[PDB]
Subunit: 161 residues, 4 copies
Amino acid sequence: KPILIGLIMGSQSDWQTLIHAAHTLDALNIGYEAEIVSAHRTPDKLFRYAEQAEARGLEVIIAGAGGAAHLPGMVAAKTSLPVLGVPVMSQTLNGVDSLLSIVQMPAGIPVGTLSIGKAGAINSALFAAAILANKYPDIRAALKHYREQQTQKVLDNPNPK
Amino acid sequence: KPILIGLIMGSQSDWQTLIHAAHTLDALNIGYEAEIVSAHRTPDKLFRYAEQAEARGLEVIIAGAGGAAHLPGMVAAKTSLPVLGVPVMSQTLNGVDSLLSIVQMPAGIPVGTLSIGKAGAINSALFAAAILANKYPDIRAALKHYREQQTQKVLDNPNPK
Amino acid sequence: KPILIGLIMGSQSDWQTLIHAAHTLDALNIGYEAEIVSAHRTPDKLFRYAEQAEARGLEVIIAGAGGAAHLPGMVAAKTSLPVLGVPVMSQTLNGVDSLLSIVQMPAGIPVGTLSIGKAGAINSALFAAAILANKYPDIRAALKHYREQQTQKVLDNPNPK
Amino acid sequence: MKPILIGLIMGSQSDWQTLIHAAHTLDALNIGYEAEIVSAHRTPDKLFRYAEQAEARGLEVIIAGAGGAAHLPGMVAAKTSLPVLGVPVMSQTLNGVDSLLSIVQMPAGIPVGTLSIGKAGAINSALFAAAILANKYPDIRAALKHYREQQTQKVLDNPNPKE
Ligand SMILES: [Cl-]
Ligand SMILES: [Cl-]
Ligand SMILES: [Cl-]
Ligand SMILES: [Cl-]
């Protein structure tokens, strides 16, 4: 598969969250690469990664970070590719710091932000798929099948007891 | 015993909370039906459920959901029956997202909102009973007896340990 | 020993917090009575308790409640004795609901509010002692000795290693 | 041996479970420090004496950690002109939100340089104290730059989260 998504994160611990994005992309048969890129510990690598993403064929970036989360916004500052932000749960503030430091970008440089935590990692993969589905009919077919199946599963299990 | 209450929730995991509503209704001998209805995964079923509730004889709907909780508000948009919202505790924000997404309805479509979590599930049943008690003398007697025995149990155990 | 403090709480579970007030009062040799008084389940008892507290010789009331905590405020509405409020930690909102429902009394009826949780229960006892110490030299001496011992204990143990 | 340049203080013994990580970082940087329990609420007189003596003793930075209604950093900054760093200790009831606001929201006139809630802020208080000292002490500047260079290279050497 062509590698269409860069799935990046500030630290190894963030992988416990963003692995769920990767699992969802695998389920949809969408090619991706997963890489640790730290805004704070590898700032020059962040610039290289963002600068070269478009030329390497990436079309969507999913960036996860926690706390004072600067990785998604700084990548969006350095590439015009759409950047999705996953707020990682933080130990002290339950990802509220993560959420506000990702979603509240001032006008001019956007980051499309998903839910705090695992839900947001899964939804970042589903949202990247929706973006790619406008271009790639096989991805659109895969996404619609995913949504149809998830709908049918709830319909066929209506009783909580 | 007529089925007067529809007890609905977005997902199977919500039942861990809304089962306490069901237990309370069973204690008051009030007929209900419990069903999984997802605003996000079964939107068409949500609309059909709300459209048909009155014709099926339901008089109150108790709807529980967590996170960005859209189930109560969309049911209230689609039936004129009173809809009670139970904010389910969320893992990341402790049901604060659930609470605000249910209670803060703009003017025009109301949802009567109860406490976050189990306390709100129990109180949604007691509140549905209070609604029904204006019309059904047997339910008024059951609710008054419940409240009197609840009061006496505290009075009968005045000393802590 | 004369009973100078009424130590009241809305439910048995609150005693896990307010027992630390009782312990502190025991250490200061201040007489108190501890009782379950529920704003929501025994409202008539709350009114009788408040009405009779002054004639009974009580001088300070410590009231603990969690969630939508109405017990301290309604006692303060029904007796002119100083009422101290202890916000009990809540399962869903970590006592933030408890704190705001106690401290934010509108002008006209005050509740002297202490910290959320165990720290506030201990401090409610110490503050009640501070109130009584204006009257009772034995209590003033006990409180000053408590404060002197806790200061000297920290001074005598300056090294965290 | 090492002259003591940092006073590392905290309101209670339980705060040491957080500030020990500041001590560990200063040990790694070979910076002389002294750790002490100084309680704004239980030893107010000692707080004033500690702050009054700090400059003459040769301390150049104070790291102060406290939780809840955290008054230790601000009152030390009120009583010495040395730079005071504040570490908000995570509180059991409010997760250090009370700690954070009672430290960082100082009115104009008396500053406290505030770090992250909890262990991250304890580590960063040590690194920030090193940055302050590095302007004056080239040995500490070299230790701090080496710490940063090593932590950068370690991430660069481990790019794949799947191992
Ligand atoms: Cl770098
Ligand atoms: Cl559907
Ligand atoms: Cl009563
Ligand atoms: Cl002192």
